[PDB]
Write a protein that binds this ligand. Sequence first.
Ligand SMILES: *C(=O)[C@H](CCC[C@H](N)C(=O)O)NC(=O)CC[C@@H](N)C(=O)O
Length: 492
Amino acid sequence: RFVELGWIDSTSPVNEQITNPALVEQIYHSNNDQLLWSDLATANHFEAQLEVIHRASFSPLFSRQLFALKSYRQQDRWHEYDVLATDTLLQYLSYAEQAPKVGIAWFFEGQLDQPLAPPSEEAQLALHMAIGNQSLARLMDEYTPQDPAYQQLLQAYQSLSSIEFNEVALYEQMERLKRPGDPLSHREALVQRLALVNLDTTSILNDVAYYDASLEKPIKQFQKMHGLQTDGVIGPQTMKWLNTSVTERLALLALNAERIRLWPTQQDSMIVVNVPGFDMKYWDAGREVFESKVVVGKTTRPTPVMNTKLDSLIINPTWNVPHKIMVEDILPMVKRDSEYLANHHMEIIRGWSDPEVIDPALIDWEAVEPETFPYRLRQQAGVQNALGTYKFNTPNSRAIYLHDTPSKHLFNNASRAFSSGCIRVENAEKFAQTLLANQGITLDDFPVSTQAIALKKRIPVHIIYQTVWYEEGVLHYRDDIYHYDALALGNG
Ligand SMILES: *C(=O)[C@H](CCC[C@H](N)C(=O)O)NC(=O)CC[C@@H](N)C(=O)O
């Protein structure tokens, strides 16, 4: 298959690189077979967009086409460049349209490594019009999220890009922890690395030999920006981020900017949990009506990025221990600690369909193998239940949901990856009250027995993974707990 254009030989390598020759030739024929990319500023603008996608590292497709474009350009093969650019712009338009629909597959469950379906007729009309007006640069901009949050990441990207290769000494210290009052060997590298993330360094005193008062606010601001405990102590967590290179920050800005294409913005009614920020928000009628900290899955039992809906609440839930938890976690402890089941208010039941309670005294524990244990565990409802007082049921293929917790001290931690995958909600009682108020449900008598409550209006729940974002006028960075930034960072 060869692109039917006079000024492209059938033997040209672009015939193997073009994903949609039929549509590309029609666009040219509709435009009198004129070149679309003869304005270098327009070529530059599209390569700069592809360079963001390339650095983000989620798309072998776009990386492959960018490398081919740059090669044709280095050789002044502008006719080939022209047709490959036009093909690649159709892929970009499809990417822009498809990201919010299926993009999880490109960022979290795989990569964008195969060509996409052609963009919509609306995109194809906007392209035809843009070609007529030589407004391709504006078209590309219109197919970015029209969202100040996205533009804040791209603005920082553009600032840092201009100083990417300036030498900045690493911050070094002799001891593991440096506290206010301690001598400092590397004050200048420290102040330069605070300045790199746009913190006000103008009141830091020059040539002071120790961690003085003038450094304390900037250090705590740096800690807060990176989600660290704001203890003022320059330890390994603080230094990891101080010593992050501009190249690595640019990778994080690019990947996080492109991830914004995935996430819904409608505030009709939505719940969003950002895993690596360990927080959540609930919007009703276009307003934030609830926010709280959360606990999320341990790195070995990760909370998946997913879309689901909140179908129902259980007030005073029991906990039906999943088979895998029973076998791997609990029964080994039961075998070694004859007070475990009483202490955790856990009953042995014949099965879910047959909740006959069996006294653990009636079982020969010596003979029990967790793997073959034929009964099930059910934790009684109450304030010490692992689900607390509230289960927020969000049915999905990974069996993830939201719940209250008796372990509320964990919300005081800066890093909150403690669960088996589920999301534990701080102020769960307030979340339930707000949900049920908005649904036109309220209990005149608060049950002290288990009660399942169907939502009348199902609420979309978006579990997202955003390690850089803009909020209250500043950028926030978070540790890549599930290693989804790892390929972009280059850190193996
Ligand atoms: C959520 O994590 C839940 C287990 C109950 C809550 C837990 N104790 C917590 O750590 O917050 N579900 C799962 O762990 C998934 C288990 C899966 N095998 C299943 O079928 O339920």
